[PDB]
Amino acid sequence: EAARAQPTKPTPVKPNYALKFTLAGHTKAVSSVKFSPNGEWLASSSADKLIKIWGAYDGKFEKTISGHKLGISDVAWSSDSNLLVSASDDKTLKIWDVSSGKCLKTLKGHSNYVFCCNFNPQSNLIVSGSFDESVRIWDVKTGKCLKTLPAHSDPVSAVHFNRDGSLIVSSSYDGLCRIWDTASGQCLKTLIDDDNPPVSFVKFSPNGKYILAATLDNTLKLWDYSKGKCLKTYTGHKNEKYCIFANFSVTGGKWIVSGSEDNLVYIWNLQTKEIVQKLQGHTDVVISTACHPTENIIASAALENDKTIKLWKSDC
Ligand SMILES: [Cl-]
């Protein structure tokens, strides 16, 4: 209670994530969970055609958002935490007012399931990837498609803007990770290696220098996209069948976090590539993980035999 009255070789750090809450309510597989940028909320999407909003710190159910006619594969937040965008099998994205639950815009243009979506940092744009093999860039304000990029020759598994919105990275079962100029629509670089497995996920690092890429040979890799080379490889998990989300955990220790088809959340040391924790609790494939913006909190979500989201917290 008073600072003066309190008493004062490096050893590797490991996190100590422990289960705090299980969030149930979806009636089919959960597909994606994302924390709001302001840290207050978690949004989840599901095969049940619903989005649900939950308290990030207490896991308290807040609301259900509905309107899509078929199941939903992804959801993402605007930078101000006020909007969501969702990507559905109904071939549309919808933009939602989080406070009201209302659909503000339906984004029509894709000719097959919409698989992945994200706002840019400005949040004037949304990027989407589809089974129709295209990446589309949309105007948030008008709902109009601004550009259709003939990006891939198979479904687009992920799309992500870099920290200033100047680049988009896309991935596909076609084996490619492609980097696009947001303004011009031109492909600036294609990351390719000899092994060339299907690419199931991609995301820029927070500092924008690296790209984390998941491939369906049970591997995650960290690319330096400027240098066009692989810096790090993370293995030990199972990933041959699904587009599982992975993350840079930056609030405490510097980790890579992923789901896995063995029903665990995996956490690796980014530099050493050693697995530092495996989180056991889910009863089906962990399709999605997300890391809280400011606290050492992970959200995880699982497929049809589980249908729950779990919140885990660590001291580091
Ligand atoms: Cl380290």
Domain containing residue 238: CATH number: 2.130.10.10
Distance 83 CA to ligand 1 centre (A): 35
Query: How many angstroms separate the alpha carbon of residue 269 from the centre of ligand 1?
Result: 6
Q: Give residue 306 CA to ligand 1 midpoint distance, Å.
A: 33
Q: Could you tell me the distance, in angstroms and rounded to a whole number, from the CA of residue 253 to the centre of ligand 1?
A: 8
How many whole angstroms from 268 Cα to the centroid of ligand 1? 10
Residue given tokens 């063995």 in the structure block? 262
> Can you tell me the distance from the alpha carbon of 58 to that of 273, in angstroms, rounded to the nearest whole number?
32
Residue 249's domain comprises 1-316
CA distance readout (Å), 109 to 87, 97, 144: 12, 21, 9
How many angstroms is it from 293 CA to the middle of ligand 1? Answer: 20
Distance 267 CA to ligand 1 centre (A): 13
Q: Tell me which method was used to determine the 3D structure.
A: X-ray
Distance 8 CA to ligand 1 centre (A): 25
Domain count, the chain: 1
- How much distance in Å is there from the Cα of 273 to the middle of ligand 1? 9
CB 179 within 8 Å of CB 225: yes
